[PDB]
């Protein structure tokens, strides 16, 4: 990138969270800008071809996508570069199967089967909150999408809360506060994919991030960053987890 943006990606330099053979070929798919970031998402082509195995080559994979066979959060996606990320839902209505994308115990992305009833909800962590013209409130989520609320409701929402959203209509149906006793799932770091309940919260001076303590099922305590803790229920999970 001497004069401008990069458009290519070598296999050896690909993100470490994909399931991919790094020496089989030279190039990999450089993902398009979109919802999540490079460290927590994977292009759709690898989901079609490498993970589920409905195609052998990229060319016939593009023929499936251009016919409208895959839904992500209930919306048709045709771009083979489109990123799919944490807590997203993948639906194939023709075969009638649904999956949720989740990190592994070693940090890689996997597809977890779920029921059709649960496939209509998506949990969204509140990443930021601001004031917008007309004195309305805009909520900015962990996957980059936004929502608007009136000034009357401004005290029901704070950062790190989780909103259960109905897709594709994008209508709110639940709010899960972040506090002691909440049920959390870890999405990054050394303690990735562990889950439990919140025990303590600690804070530091001068912009150092804050840390939380979590108790798991067997009674062990472990710490992590506050922003790595995803709230999934009051005292039991609201979604199916492995």
């Amino acid at each position: 990138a001497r004069k401008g943006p990069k458009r290519h990606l070598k296999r050896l330099a690909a993100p470490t969270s994909w399931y991919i053979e790094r020496k089989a070929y030279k190039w990999a798919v450089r993902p398009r800008p979109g919802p999540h970031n490079m460290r927590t998402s994977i292009p759709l082509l690898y989901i079609v071809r490498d993970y589920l195995g409905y195609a052998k080559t990229a060319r016939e994979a593009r023929k499936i996508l251009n016919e409208g066979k895959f839904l992500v959060d209930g919306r048709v996606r045709k771009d083979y570069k489109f990123p799919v990320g944490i807590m997203d839902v993948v639906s194939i209505p023709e075969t009638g199967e649904h999956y949720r994308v989740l990190p592994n115990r070693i940090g890689k992305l996997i597809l977890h089967p779920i029921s059709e009833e649960e496939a209509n909800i998506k949990p969204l962590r509140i990443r930021n909150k601001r004031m917008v013209k007309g004195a309305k409130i805009q909520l900015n989520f962990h996957d980059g999408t936004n929502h608007l609320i009136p000034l009357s409701e401004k005290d029901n929402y704070f950062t790190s809360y989780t909103v259960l959203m109905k897709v594709p209509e994008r209508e709110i149906l639940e709010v899960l506060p972040f506090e002691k006793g909440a049920y959390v799932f870890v999405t990054q770091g050394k303690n990735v994919a562990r889950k439990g309940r919140i025990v303590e919260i600690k804070k530091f001076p001068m912009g150092w991030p804050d840390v939380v303590t979590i108790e798991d099922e067997e009674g062990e305590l472990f710490d992590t960053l506050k922003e790595y803790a995803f709230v999934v229920g009051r005292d039991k999970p609201r979604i199916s987890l492995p």
């Binding site: 409905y54 499936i64 194939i92 075969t95």
Partner: protein, 96 residues
């Protein structure tokens, strides 16, 4: 030569079925594509004009070979999905 089917998997998105098989044949040459197609068609009672054999592969010191084949329910879909070279190689269409 004797044929044993190992797995048969359906693909509703493409509209085909994918078949994996083994051929056991001590003391014989590698089976031809014609013989394999005829035997495979008869065992499965499948129309022969919409059946493609992707490959037949032999190994170093084995008495058996591994094969992979595909069956399409419609001729138009087959002509639309498969590359030209695999149809020419299997005798389905004639070269230009």
């Amino acid at each position: 030569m004797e044929i044993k089917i190992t797995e048969v998997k359906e693909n509703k998105l493409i509209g085909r079925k994918e078949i994996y098989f083994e051929i056991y044949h001590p003391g014989e040459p590698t089976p031809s594509r014609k013989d394999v197609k005829g035997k495979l068609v008869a065992m499965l009672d499948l129309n022969p004009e919409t059946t493609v054999i992707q490959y037949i592969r032999s190994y170093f010191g084995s008495y058996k070979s591994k094969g992979y084949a595909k069956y399409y329910y419609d001729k138009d879909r087959m002509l639309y999905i498969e590359p030209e070279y695999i149809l020419i190689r299997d005798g389905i269409i004639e070269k230009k």
